[PDB]
Design a protein around this ligand. Structure first.
Ligand SMILES: C[C@H](CCOc1ccc(I)cc1)CCN1CCN(c2ccncc2)C1=O
Ligand SMILES: C[C@H](CCOc1ccc(I)cc1)CCN1CCN(c2ccncc2)C1=O
Lengths: 48, 97, 297, 245, 245, 297, 49
């Protein structure tokens, strides 16, 4: 969860709204196991 | 790192690029809530936009710490302090800061 | 740094679990040693105090005059692998033509071996078990006849798409393991590893899988531990058209490389459901045969 | 010399002049989780004395017709003292236990209680009597809290298993003509290094009279049975707000 | 290089890119009580990570006419997280504190808050105005809890002493054109080794605007001030039931 | 034993309080060294950042061209003992003949020195103070006359019976210390040790003396710390009959062997009561003199 | 903006304990991922078609 600790303060002349971009990934202690097919299958009918 | 679609609400084609970023703006100083999302990487939701989330779908089990880096794209003159929290299992959606 | 005495001398953090007993080699039954009459005071092997919680330490030698007996009887057939490494039925999957169950030429079976008493009672002697396994699939028609039909078995791990039909895209099986075999071939057979996220599977879990209120409608989840749910086993006739023959698939499991912890009392009431130890209250029967009087055979 | 004993841990001390030794379950003492078995990365909190002490939670009355009772651990303590708080504020928990069941009478009373510890004590229901209804035990029966719960059918331990074989678990007997208490020390038992003190009960404590209590008219008829227990090597992790369930 | 900083303790981390160094009150770091200064004999409990972490308790709004506020320690935390529980269950308590007052604005705002720590901050009353009535401050004014309390007459710190000399106490200033936070570390201060976290407040935190907040129409007018604090080297003793006061 | 790494490497228990500053010897004021013009970039002693919380480090040498000055001015008169070891009035006890106060020939005085501004303001510069003291008792009639009257002063520690009259049994003083002296003798004088149960007396205690609810009628106890209450000082004329003369006893205290901790701002509003820092709200005066304009003297 | 992923680790963001991680990375190698037979073609040879 993300909360406002203080407040987005800006002076006269600058936008009252700005955006944040989130970038995620895994740490170096991350591993995976038990290979399986993905939940999605990107095909409806036959691919011609 | 890949872009996490925290703001996964818009669905019409013309507004899809808006999922890539969420906003912040001048508030009323009441420690208001900005956004929330589950940290589950292999679960439907924001994580599905990341390469981690997709690769994750090819494996039944995972283990490890995750990391999310937030980049503020406001103007240089804009300032602010945010509280980003991670609530381990059992803790319900925090009602307040 | 640590300066106050109570901190320096504390045992907070000791990861070495002190053990009071150690395993010794016992390939054969213990021998019997010679013994003679003993008319002593102070010595009293026959007298015990069961309250303590330990079994009697009294031996043959101390209760009667014994001879010497060199016991060479082996203890090998009572090891865990010897006991469990015997293939037994743990699943049956029906693929009928005209039916109420699977009249679509495919079937999904939740991997749970608790639907069969013989096997179930054996494993439930232990609380935790870690092991690998060898699965064998015996297929034929309901009369036990063998027909030229090709089948596909596929392992669908939790999170992978479960086929919804005989023609599902999921049968492309690009990542899931699949086995293609004919009913005419010998039984298919494969080795399966220990796949739980836990250090061991457990036949008993006294708790709930999630947090929150546990109201009536959610009591179906008491005792459900995801760590035991390994996924789905799917089977289909390999064709876009319905098979000409009704089929039956019997699934046999043979554990190997077994380890078990915490023994428990053995089931003495008939099983009713896979998911729990529920028993029929109106039919609580004694563990065994009964007689008319304690003073008569 | 094996009949007398004192158990001191934390700011609490227990005494007994009619004991029957001490049982250390499965032959091993409680120990903190090693750095190799562990998986969670956050530094744990090990309160020590404030939580590893003797708590006296409940007292039942033994009667000529009692059936027996059971308590679940750590369910019984989740709402008591500093241990309870730590169990609520933290997601992860692990610890051992020293259980001391008390029950004294006179040299003219008789009876025998079997005191045992059964790991993963899953409870079952009578399935509607005929065994056709797939009923399930309610939260108040699976996690009875400190008041414990009374066995409906002791012979099968309300779980379809013979109580006659319960002795295969760490246990002691309280035979009135012999002792007035049982003492069992139990290490952490689970297939995981830590777990939720709320959602998972590692084991259950069973106190069942196998030999019925008896005495002649005129002898004190009120024979209590008290339950005192102390956590051991308590470790907690995954901090956040308190949660009761 | 003295402007940037990260404070990590427990499972909490604070960052700042406009700091003004760190103050260590009276020149010394918090330390646990030595075996020679101690007097209580029971073994203490030192929760460590579960209690020594950053807690963000309150947010006030700085205005062109604000007078200033104060919070009492450890009063502010007696009802929060695991620290609160330990402070309630135990008679004796001692610890240090890391205080981080936050307040950011824009390069076009101006103002200066004096952030100080005043030990044994005893509050007085206006004595009925004429000084004839011997009034006394109510519990809600002496131990305001987490909401703190607003100064009635900042010039004399509601105690008959000049705020102009408050700088003789560990302090920092939050001059908007210079920094957006103050950081003060405070050791245990008392004439005793341990004390009650409930009946005695070791010191008070004062946040008073000396130079009035100002800005032109059109600039964000909502300038919050948030209080985050972390106990350090917390030690507790004299266990028993929980007590709120 | 301790095995897990986080325990072995923890600092939980360090009783050695790391100090960032150490006291150096300073018997005289610092000397001034010679200095010359400096026209540098990067160097800037005059510029400071008060926000940090520290006082300026800029010195005379770095702000102007200075000569050499050997400063031999002593710092001795500003030590704690030099400042406090000066006897001052801390109590007055009246023993009138015909009066409304003590017309019984005896009086009990609670040992509290906060009834006199001069002394009080000095000690309140510090939060905690530990010291021994020398008490001097000056007695005479109200005109300052000396009369042949014998008096008895007695120290009644907390818990000892307070005399309730001139003839009380408590004046037997078998254990309490008492001083018998005539008004004609020089002032009585004795040494008193540091008697608190705490390591130091404290002029400010932000708390309550007991647990429980702190309702209105009990707010009289906010700030009351028993550790500062050393007992009662009782005085009587030595006789079973009333004295023929009215008396006044002035009590002077001279601290010695002083130690103080935590300096505080100094009182700037008139004192009103002994027990608290209450001030007159309608008369909050500036700390000092004021003027008409900031640009005029 | 630099274009690199965060270098911040668990140890530097919170007080961590020691954990000896023995979890294998073997099942995520290229061969482990791709060396699984999957359908890539279907060829029909009908009689009347
Ligand atoms: C050995 C099986 C897993 C077999 O997995 C596969 C996987 C692929 C294939 I091809 C064949 C079998 C697990 C059996 N277990 C683990 C514990 N468990 C269980 C069932 C009901 N209640 C508690 C535990 C249970 O049924
Ligand atoms: C030096 C005195 C004790 C003198 O004790 C005796 C004892 C015997 C005799 I004969 C004369 C004097 C204590 C003075 N103090 C200690 C602190 N204190 C106090 C007063 C009001 N508020 C806080 C503290 C206060 O008034």
């Amino acid at each position: 969860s993300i909360w406002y600790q203080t407040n987005y303060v800006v002076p006269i002349g600058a936008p009252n709204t700005a955006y944040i971009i989130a970038l995620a990934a895994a740490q170096k202690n991350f591993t995976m196991k038990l290979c399986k097919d993905a939940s999605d299958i990107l095909q409806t009918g036959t691919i011609q | 790192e890949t872009i996490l679609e925290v703001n996964n609400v818009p669905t019409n084609a013309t507004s899809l690029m808006e999922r890539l970023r969420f906003p912040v703006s001048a508030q009323a100083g009441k420690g208001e809530l900005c956004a929330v999302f589950r940290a589950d990487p292999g679960r439907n939701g924001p994580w599905q936009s990341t390469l981690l989330g997709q690769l994750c779908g090819y494996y039944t089990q995972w283990s490890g710490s995750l990391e999310v880096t937030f980049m503020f794209t406001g103007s240089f003159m804009a300032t602010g302090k945010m509280l980003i929290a991670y609530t381990p299992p059992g803790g319900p959606l925090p009602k307040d800061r | 740094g640590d300066r106050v005495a109570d901190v320096i001398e504390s045992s907070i953090g000791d990861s070495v679990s002190r053990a009071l007993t150690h395993a010794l080699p016992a390939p054969t039954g213990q021998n019997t040693q010679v013994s003679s009459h003993r008319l002593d005071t102070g010595k009293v092997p026959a007298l015990q105090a069961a309250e303590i919680g330990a079994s009697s330490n009294a031996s043959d030698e101390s209760m009667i005059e014994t001879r010497c007996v060199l016991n060479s009887h082996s203890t090998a057939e009572t090891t865990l692998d010897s006991f469990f490494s015997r293939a037994g039925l743990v699943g049956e999957i029906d693929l009928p033509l005209k039916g109420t169950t699977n009249p679509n030429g495919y079937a999904n079976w939740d991997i749970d071996i608790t639907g069969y008493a013989q096997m179930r009672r054996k494993v439930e002697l232990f609380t935790y078990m870690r092991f690998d396994a060898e699965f064998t699939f015996v297929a034929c028609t309901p009369t036990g006849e063998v027909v030229p039909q090709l089948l596909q078995y596929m392992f669908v791990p939790p999170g992978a798409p479960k086929p919804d039909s005989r023609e599902s895209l999921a049968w492309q099986t690009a990542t899931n393991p699949s086995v293609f075999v004919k009913l005419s071939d010998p039984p298919a057979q494969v080795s399966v590893p220990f796949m739980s996220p836990a250090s061991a599977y457990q036949w008993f879990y006294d708790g709930y899988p999630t947090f929150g209120e546990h109201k009536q409608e959610k009591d179906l989840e008491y005792g459900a531990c995801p760590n035991n749910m390994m996924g789905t086993f799917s089977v289909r006739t390999v064709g876009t058209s319905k098979s000409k023959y009704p089929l039956v698939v019997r699934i046999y499991m043979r554990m190997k490389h077994v380890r078990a912890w915490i023994p428990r009392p053995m089931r003495n009431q008939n099983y009713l459901f896979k998911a729990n130890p529920n028993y029929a209250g109106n039919s609580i029967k004694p563990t065994g045969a009964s007689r008319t009087a304690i003073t008569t055979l | 010399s094996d009949r007398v004993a004192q158990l001191t841990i934390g700011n609490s001390t227990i005494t007994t002049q009619e004991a029957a030794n001490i049982i250390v379950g499965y032959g091993e003492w409680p120990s903190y989780c090693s750095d190799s078995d562990a998986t969670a990365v956050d530094k744990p909190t090990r309160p020590d004395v404030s939580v590893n002490r003797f708590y006296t939670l409940d007292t039942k009355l033994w009667e000529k017709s009692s059936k027996g009772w059971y308590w679940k651990f750590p369910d019984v303590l989740t709402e008591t003292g500093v241990f309870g708080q730590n169990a609520q504020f933290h997601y992860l928990y692990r610890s051992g236990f020293c259980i001391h069941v008390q029950c004294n009478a006179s040299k003219f009373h008789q009876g025998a209680l079997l005191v045992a510890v059964l790991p993963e004590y899953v409870i079952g229901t009578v399935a509607g009597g005929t065994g056709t209804e797939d009923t399930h035990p309610p939260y108040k029966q699976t996690q009875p809290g400190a008041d414990g719960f009374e066995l409906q059918h002791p012979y099968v331990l309300d779980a379809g298993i013979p109580i006659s074989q319960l002795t295969v678990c760490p246990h002691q007997w309280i035979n009135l003509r012999t002792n007035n208490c049982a003492t069992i020390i139990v290490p952490y038992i689970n297939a995981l290094p830590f777990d939720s003190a709320l959602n998972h009960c590692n084991f259950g404590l069973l106190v069942v009279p196998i030999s019925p209590l008896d005495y002649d008219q005129g002898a004190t008829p009120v024979i209590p049975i008290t339950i005192t227990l102390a956590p051991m090597c308590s470790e907690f992790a995954g901090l956040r707000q308190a949660v009761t369930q």
